[PDB]
Structure formats: C-alpha cells, structure tokens
Amino acid sequence: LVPRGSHMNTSELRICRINKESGPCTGGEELYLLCDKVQKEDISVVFSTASWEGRADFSQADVHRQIAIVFKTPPYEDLEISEPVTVNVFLQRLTDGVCSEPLPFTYLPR
Amino acid sequence: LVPRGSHMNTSELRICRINKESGPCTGGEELYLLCDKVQKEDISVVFSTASWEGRADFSQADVHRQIAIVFKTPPYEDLEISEPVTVNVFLQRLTDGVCSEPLPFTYLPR
C-alpha cells in the first residue's frame, strides 16, 4: 500500500483499459472499462486532477465477469475499396465448428 | 443449434462488444472483444461476408478472464474548456478507500 496524494494505491486493484480514451467534457457518456478482480458491492470509478474529483455512475448490475480476447484483424479481401464495407465478426469453436451470432465491423478505405 | 449459412450458431457463444466498430481494410490492427465463457484452447475469431472469410490472429495468452464495468462519465469541472484536458481515471474501494493506479482520459471541448 503506497501513498498517492490523499489516498493509498494497491497492486490488487487494476484497470486494464477504457474503451474510449476521450470524450465530451459534458459527461453523461456511457463508457466501459476492463479491470482485474473487484467486488461489485465495494468499488467505484473516479475521474480526477490535482484539485478536482468526480465519480462515475454505475450500479452493481453494471459490473460483469467477462472474457476479453485481444487479437489482430485479418485484412479485407479488397484493399482498394473506395467506400466503407461492414462485415460480420463472430466466435467459432474449433472442435465442433459451432459459432456465435455476429457483430458488425466496418473496413475503411486507405 | 440453429443453422446459419454453412455452420451452426449457439446461444452458448456470445460476443458482447468489440472495442472499435471500424478500422483500415489493411488489417493487422490490434482490437479486443468481450464475450461470454469460451475455452481459450478451442476458440477463434472470424470476419466474414457471404462470399468471404478471414480469421483474426491471437494466441491462448490473448484470452483473458476480466471484469468489465459499464458506467456513465461525470462531467468535467469546466464545461467551457477551449482545449483538450486529460485527467486521471482509477478504481477506488469504498470500504478502505484503497485505489488503483490511474489511466488517462481526456475531456474534449463542446
């Protein structure tokens, strides 16, 4: 437990990433972050600067145990597309080839 | 197990979201997705269209068990900022007030 300003930091609590790295100063924006183990009934998200502090709003129901898969995308068939093209992205199990419902993803021209 | 083209889909496999909804048709882009339970040794990510298919590249080491927190951002102190301002975002446990290392987030003007 190392000191950090007016509070203590621990290696036990860790944020891996935030889906977006920026947003409107107006707030009320819905984002999501990935983190190591936390207790949904005893956690919070804080935004701060040396002299300012604001808390994010969420409920226990917004804390989900999920699996995150980091991956590199395959290139699209045609690298010369002049317009955006949105394909399907889905999971597929190797053993029985069963898949998941797809989610859209759009390839952008060069 | 419902038919879907040349394969079968299941409610057992589910993608919740992809961090980015678009990217260069050139591929080789590093993205990450959230999904329900999968077996790291028996899963894959596919991008496709009716007549095209490409697989994403990742290893078992890229499949992580994580906790995802959905939340709404607090507004920034000053809604009149003319330039970008990047603050700190971190987790904080309510019981003992212990925090996590911060991650940057930048508020953008209106």
Curated annotation (Swiss-Prot), chains A, B:
Compartment(s): Nucleus; Cytoplasm, Cytoskeleton, Microtubule organizing center, Centrosome
UniProt modification remark: Phosphorylation at 'Thr-103' and 'Ser-573' is followed by proteasomal degradation.
Outcome after substituting S100 to A/E: Strongly reduces transcriptional activity and interaction with NFKB1/p50 and NFKB2/p52
Tissue: Expressed in intestine, thymus and spleen. Undetectable in liver, bome marrow, kidney and testis.
Domain of life from the UniProt record: Eukaryota
SUBUNIT field: Component of the NF-kappa-B RelB-p50 complex. Component of the NF-kappa-B RelB-p52 complex. Self-associates; the interaction seems to be transient and may prevent degradation allowing for heterodimer formation p50 or p52. Interacts with NFKB1/p50, NFKB2/p52 and NFKB2/p100. Interacts with NFKBID. Interacts with BMAL1 and the interaction is enhanced in the presence of CLOCK.
Comment text on domains: Both N- and C-terminal domains are required for transcriptional activation.
Its job: NF-kappa-B is a pleiotropic transcription factor which is present in almost all cell types and is involved in many biological processed such as inflammation, immunity, differentiation, cell growth, tumorigenesis and apoptosis. NF-kappa-B is a homo- or heterodimeric complex formed by the Rel-like domain-containing proteins RELA/p65, RELB, NFKB1/p105, NFKB1/p50, REL and NFKB2/p52. The dimers bind at kappa-B sites in the DNA of their target genes and the individual dimers have distinct preferences for different kappa-B sites that they can bind with distinguishable affinity and specificity.
Protein name: Transcription factor RelB
Species whose genome carries this gene: Mus musculus (Mouse)
Gene field: Relb
